[PDB]
Design a protein around this ligand. Structure first.
Ligand code: SF4
Ligand code: SF4
Ligand code: FCO
Ligand code: FCO
Ligand code: SF3
Ligand code: SF3
Ligand code: F3S
Ligand code: F3S
Ligand SMILES: [Mg+2]
Ligand SMILES: [Mg+2]
Ligand code: 3NI
Ligand code: 3NI
Ligand SMILES: [O]
Lengths: 595, 273, 267, 595
């Protein structure tokens, strides 16, 4: 068939079918199928979420104050963001305002998660789509050192002997014949474009990042007890503050704990600036001729907006939200998660049932009733899918749309929205990153002509990857501001952390509904709760990967993952490096997507 | 040769995998490069699709009876198992095939050990912990390392024990290593002096909260929870839930999600009960 | 301008100075480069003798009433004070001269706070803690930060508090910051459940020892000792005496050396 | 006067007198006075210990089981070594044999101390006698990187941008006009011979060492509760071991704690070999023409011997002891701390009284009775010493002699003794270090003639400094061996840590005496105890700095400090860089020396 989608794609499944199941180096479980034409160009893409747990069903009848802990376990990668959305949703329903220090500490925890999640994503999940560790074994350590000094002059770890020592270790690993995570990698695929020296630099930084990442989450351990899965509460934060009073040493937050947080923040800022951002820029330069994967980012992007400089005042959001539609960056459409005509979820191509499946349901009206059922054109059987039938139900992911539009969410969406709304910090990051990208390109190709087209640059797999790294850096700077504000509040006499006026259900209205939003690491997250007589009547999550990984809607619009693959040539369709590189650039979280 | 480890993922949130890489000592980098051979792990592995499934087949035959099968998450039995699909087939089939030829199983976390959040009422997928799925006839050890997630150094501590001392650690009746799970939180809790003196947090951010008083009245499940949180603690010994001011929610105990509200008070506190 | 700090050393073992540089956060390098101006410290100074002495004179004059005087160790009164000689003269004379024009004094450690080991019976040098040496008429704050030595992050925590919040921390009746010294070890001890259950180490390396049972019966002085050892703990939160299996010996408390054998029960 | 000492020095106090009080960058309090001739060459040297506390007096009547904690507080720098000597002395007196794991854990703690103490000494106490931080501000960062790569190819921290950033920080500090510890440093003195690049490299490593040192002592925190001042006990170690049993997580030593110790050991080994040892070798090469300060080291050296591969078997000491006398390296005289004709202390030039002051007392017969009294040739008064009278009593340090000989103790003494006794590890370190030294010399001077004379090379302030660094590296290797043995013991079923058979004083003899020896960081340490009816009758300490910093004896022999200064030319007698450099090379611990 050839399907002409309302969002201007031609989905053609007549070509050779390629199946990727499991998609690895993601959180959770995904299957992807594509069709390629005679020139090995993708002409159809099918996103299948291959897990479901039913948190929305499990929550029914429980106490809203307990919800945050259940939904936190939607995901251990984006650990905490669901807890944050939950407490915000309950607080919204019950008209609870939290103390300023609770606001600040929650944002510090959120920005800690952003940095940790972005770093580990790029190195531990994404890098092996750009980096060939076997090729690193061919590098000259002195030339690797020279490249390192150009890539990031401030990073101290550049000795040729250090790179040689890393190389010896990877050589020993390879020589053992136990290749572990590297086994069966597509290392001979010409899709890998780094020099041996760049591969060795990147492998070195994968190891440095694995060492570093365990440090930054100590901020979650201080404020939230543990990472993964720090604690939250409705009405405040549990980490009471006592700097100077009786038994301060035994309080959750005292002078020593604050000094520890300061040290951790600065370490994160340094890693962002000296390792992560320069690597993404330099790797992007090596791949300067590979600008595929833009998909919907060119046209339709959305975020709810986050990080208000003034608590509870969205006009001060440091990552302002809204929706850009049809590529018009000059028109920011306001997004209201309360409006039943805006966020809606369809299930016509998902493994769920609605009484009326023509309907898109706003999440206060959402329904989660499983319906695992394969289309009659499926190749295989109910417990053995060979080729999924995308004309019918093909995913555990629902199809969210915004006023009927399919949109992309994530750091790139936020960066577009912030750039378009004149956020100077972001505009400066974008322009300096483009200048740096062009500089490294010229190091590699002395005849390089500068890229100037911001839509082409940002609206790509490379751009999506870059935006994530830039967002990490921005979060580190914002977190330091938050910390300084926390110290100022304490200095000005405010050590308060919780509001308990509405802790007891006797204080609640008989019927209430609320929505909590979060700029989660992968994009726009919200939870919608309906409370009745002290209990959860409905609880519906629409999460970033739900948006990006969405199957088709009743009109045939394709979601962000499927769009991003369309038109991409593959060197070797059966060694699908390009598909993985682009899918991974969305940082898919499949447990999130399905919950 | 480094000990072959196959790390499978069922229905899960991936928190145990995340916790593992938080390990302060040994570092995860050294575990993977120098201690074990992490032969399959859909989270970190270079290969996908057919290339990934080829490894499972190869390792199963080449190292038949000699690999450790680590399992995070759990198999669903509803939806014909297709609420967790891997390679187009139910995860339960992958788990069974690999369990057949494992030397031993490590059930990482509360998902694999007991069921965790997806198993909480009404359990729409009939998520089933590994030991119950394999049944009473399964004849290899299943080492349960529960917690949501377990402490990082507990996870790596189990592995280093097996590699250093050449045996499975001694397990309690529930299959948990006595190494780490043979005391209750409340048996080694630094806030116990306050519990003893009837000094409690009564309301969030009260006088008691700011002094680090006991969290029993706000729902601490430390009295019934066996884990190393109050001894080893979390994130390189930085903190644990109680230190940072929230009661234990009981996250390593079988059935903790349905035990009661996290803010309900813990039971079986009196000897005259 | 960074806060001037003069760090004097009387009769001492230098443990407090060592502890200070163990600080995990802030790092000692950052304290000295960025937070304070460590203007005199015999342990670290490039200059010696006359050149070192010249600095005390200079700082005392230039920053009269504006420097913090940190004191480790204590002045002896026997031997005409010449059991501690600096620049040919009794240390007590140096201490008095600098105390006269200090903004405030920090008594680091049990030596400066109380006397510590040299003051234990029969105190051959008549070693005397700073507050007693200066007497009741001394009109600037003396912040006692006791312990042998104090915890590293307690020491740097006191400094960061003063720099961040622009006041001397609240002190208890003994002059100790409530920040760190307002609970007993036993009031926040993770072995307390065992104490409560009568589960004790009875002999070294018995069953109880191997289970981490309470150390009361082997002499733990936790029940009478105010410090942050069971909360902040030691060496970047790595351990504390009780965790590693030896009872507290009471090392932050006035007179601990003469309270009795360390292995005799707390009464 | 001109005094012709039996140990072949001519002490001449007719020239200009220079007084250094305080001697800074040591532990505790010292005064040094010298006389210089018309050529600015030192012709007299006077070592004065300027503190005393009286621990030996304080111990009288107390319980031997408590002694370790009192004497540990002799010193917070060499923290632990006195506790170790004490428990060994009591165990010797009472015929207590400790379990193998207790032996091992004590040796791991000892080697931890050696590494910490040696590193902090070199960088934080010694380096400013060799390194000019002001001159560092003139360095070229690129050239500093090149030097770093040659000095230590494996050390990763070599980026020009890193050295530039360090320089910027030091420049900011200097520009503030608050010079702190650098104020009035002798920075214009030509005695400073490093290039600006070597100064910058060294300052950078001073900072790296300050960050590192806090890590290694975490081994003391694990086994001993805390550092400074870890806990010990008579009969074993308190850190009971439980790897696999009930309540293991609550035992002092469990699997996680052992993994922590492993990590810490390896970090120390890395710092020794990549930072510390290479720096001392390279700095030595810049100072290749400054071979003063040997003093007694080439003639008379002593250590008790330590670190037996087989517990309680001294023939297996990895740093074997003995005494070399009159420069005959081919004759190792056995040292017995029990022999009253061997170790003796005189007080004729010390502020103490004996009934018969002609007598040297073996420490079981030792007496500590203060006698602060100044010679009638003193310039000044009792409470204002202008020039001390070294013809009479001039120090709080007693005068220890070995069979009437003045000897040098310390890492250099141990290195000479080990080399002379064919310890291959040490011989390899010495030969490789000399080769490396000569290689760096040849780079600084292509016409360099290799040094081959081991007595001239080792018997100098440079050699003394090098031996300390080599010993640190040796201790890291030994400590890893100890850790592996501990693991093996546990694996073979032995988790025991204490012998309590003689814990109760009812089990002791009415009268007993013992001696405990330690290879302390600064040299030969021993404690001698006499027990009567369960109480301490006598407790006498003779400490390494007591030996080295010794005043003259009745026959007029000078001690190691005084000998080391004799014959040294000074660029500027009133800016005594050379004196400080040589004194500091002994790592004076003045609280130790006097106790
Ligand atoms: S109830 Fe919780 S907070 Fe209180 S002592 Fe027990 S475990 Fe600690
Ligand atoms: S006696 Fe000591 S070990 Fe026992 S609970 Fe009290 S402080 Fe802890
Ligand atoms: N970020 C993140 Fe996880 C997803 N998708 C959530 O919410
Ligand atoms: N090392 C050391 Fe301290 C001295 N001298 C002791 O003993
Ligand atoms: Fe660590 S996968 Fe996270 S949900 Fe509770 S253990 Fe499961
Ligand atoms: Fe830290 S100088 Fe050490 S003895 Fe007890 S505090 Fe004094
Ligand atoms: S909630 Fe879990 S992490 Fe520990 S403190 Fe309680 S078992
Ligand atoms: S001995 Fe001192 S270090 Fe703390 S545990 Fe007791 S006050
Ligand atoms: Mg949903
Ligand atoms: Mg003595
Ligand atoms: Ni997620
Ligand atoms: Ni000392
Ligand atoms: O996620």
């Amino acid at each position: 068939s050839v399907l002409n989608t309302p969002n201007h794609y031609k989905m053609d499944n007549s070509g050779r079918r390629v199946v990727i199941d499991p998609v690895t180096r993601i959180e959770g479980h995904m299957r992807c199928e594509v069709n390629v034409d005679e020139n090995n160009v993708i002409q159809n893409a099918v996103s299948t979420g291959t897990m479901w747990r039913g948190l929305e069903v499990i929550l029914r009848g429980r106490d809203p104050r307990d919800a945050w802990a259940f939904v936190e376990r939607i995901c251990g990668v984006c650990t905490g963001c669901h807890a944050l959305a939950s407490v915000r949703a309950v607080e919204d329903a019950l008209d609870i305002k939290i103390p300023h220090n609770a606001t600040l500490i929650r944002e510090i925890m959120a920005k800690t998660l952003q940095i940790h999640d972005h770093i580990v994503h790029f190195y531990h999940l994404h890098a092996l789509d750009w980096v060939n560790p076997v090729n690193a074994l061919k590098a000259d350590p002195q030339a690797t050192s020279e490249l390192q000094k150009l890539v990031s002059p401030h990073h101290p770890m550049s000795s040729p002997g250090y790179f040689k020592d890393i190389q010896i270790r990877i050589q020993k690993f390879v020589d053992s014949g136990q290749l572990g995570i590297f086994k069966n990698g597509y290392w001979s695929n010409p899709a890998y474009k780094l020099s041996p020296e760049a591969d060795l630099m990147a492998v070195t930084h994968y190891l440095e990042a694995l060492d570093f990442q365990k440090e930054i989450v100590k901020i979650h351990a201080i404020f939230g007890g543990k990472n993964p899965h720090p604690n939250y509460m409705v009405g405040g934060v549990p980490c009471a503050i006592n700097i100077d009073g009786d038994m301060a040493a035994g309080a959750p937050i005292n002078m020593e704990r604050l000094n520890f947080v300061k040290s951790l923040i600065e370490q994160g800022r340094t890693f962002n600036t000296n390792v992560y951002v320069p690597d993404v820029i330099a790797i992007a330069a090596f791949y300067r001729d590979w600008l595929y994967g833009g998909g919907l980012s060119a046209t339709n992007v959305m975020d709810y907006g986050a990080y208000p400089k003034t608590p509870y005042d969205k006009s001060t959001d440091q990552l302002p939200g809204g929706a850009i539609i049809n590529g018009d960056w000059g028109k920011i459409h306001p997004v209201d998660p309360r409006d039943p005509e805006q966020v809606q979820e369809f299930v016509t191509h998902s493994w769920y049932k609605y009484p009326d499946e023509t309907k898109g349901l706003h999440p206060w009206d959402g329904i989660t009733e499983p319906n695992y059922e394969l289309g009659s054109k499926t190749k295989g059987s109910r417990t053995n899918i060979i080729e999924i039938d995308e004309s019918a139900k093909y995913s555990w992911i629902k199809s969210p749309r915004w006023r009927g539009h399919a949109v992309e969410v994530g750091p790139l969406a936020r960066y577009i929205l912030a750039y378009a709304q004149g956020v100077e910090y972001v505009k400066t990051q974008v322009h300096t990153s483009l200048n740096r990208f062009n500089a490294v390109c010229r190091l590699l190709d002395p005849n390089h002509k500068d890229i100037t087209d911001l839509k082409a640059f940002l609206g790509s797999t490379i751009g999506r990857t870059l935006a994530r790294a830039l967002e990490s850096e921005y979060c580190g700077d914002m977190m330091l501001d938050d910390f300084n504000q926390l110290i100022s509040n304490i200095k000005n006499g405010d050590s308060s952390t919780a509001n308990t006026d509405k802790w007891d259900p006797s204080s609640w209205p008989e019927h209430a509904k609320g929505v909590g939003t979060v700029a989660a690491p992968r994009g726009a997250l919200a939870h919608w709760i309906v409370i009745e007589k002290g209990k959860i009547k409905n609880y519906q999550c629409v999460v970033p990967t739900t948006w990006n990984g969405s199957p088709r809607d009743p009109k045939g619009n394709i979601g962000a993952f499927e769009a991003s693959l369309m038109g991409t040539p593959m060197e070797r369709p059966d060694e699908p490096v390009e598909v993985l590189r682009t899918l991974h650039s969305f940082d898919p979280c499949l447990a999130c997507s399905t919950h | 040769p480094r000990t072959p480890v196959i790390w499978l993922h069922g229905l899960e949130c991936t928190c145990c995998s995340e916790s593992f890489i938080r390990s302060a000592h040994p570092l995860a980098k050294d575990v993977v490069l120098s201690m074990i051979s992490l032969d399959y792990d859909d989270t970190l592995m270079a290969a996908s699709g057919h290339a990934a499934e080829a490894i499972l087949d190869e390792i199963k035959e080449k190292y038949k009876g000699n690999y450790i099968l680590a399992v995070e998450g759990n198999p669903p039995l509803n939806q014909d198992g297709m609420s967790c699909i891997i390679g187009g087939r139910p995860f339960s089939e992958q788990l069974k095939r690999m369990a057949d030829d494992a030397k031993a199983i490590i059930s990482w976390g509360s998902c694999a050990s007991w069921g965790c959040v997806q198993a909480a009422k009404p359990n729409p997928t009939q998520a089933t912990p590994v030991h119950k799925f394999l049944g009473g006839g399964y004849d290899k050890p299943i080492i349960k390392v529960p917690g949501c997630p377990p402490i990082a150094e507990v996870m790596t501590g189990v592995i280093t024990y097996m590699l250093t001392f050449d045996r499975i650690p001694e397990l309690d009746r529930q299959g948990r290593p006595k190494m780490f799970y043979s005391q209750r939180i409340h048996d080694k809790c630094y806030r116990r002096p306050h519990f003893d003196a009837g000094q409690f947090v009564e309301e969030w951010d009260d006088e008691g909260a700011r002094k680090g008083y006991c969290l029993y009245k706000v729902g601490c499940k430390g009295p019934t929870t066996y884990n190393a949180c109050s001894t080893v603690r979390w994130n390189g010994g930085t903190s644990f839930p109680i230190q940072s001011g929230h009661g234990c929610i009981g996250c390593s105990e079988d059935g903790f999600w349905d035990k009661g509200s996290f803010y309900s008070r813990d039971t079986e506190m009196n000897a005259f009960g």
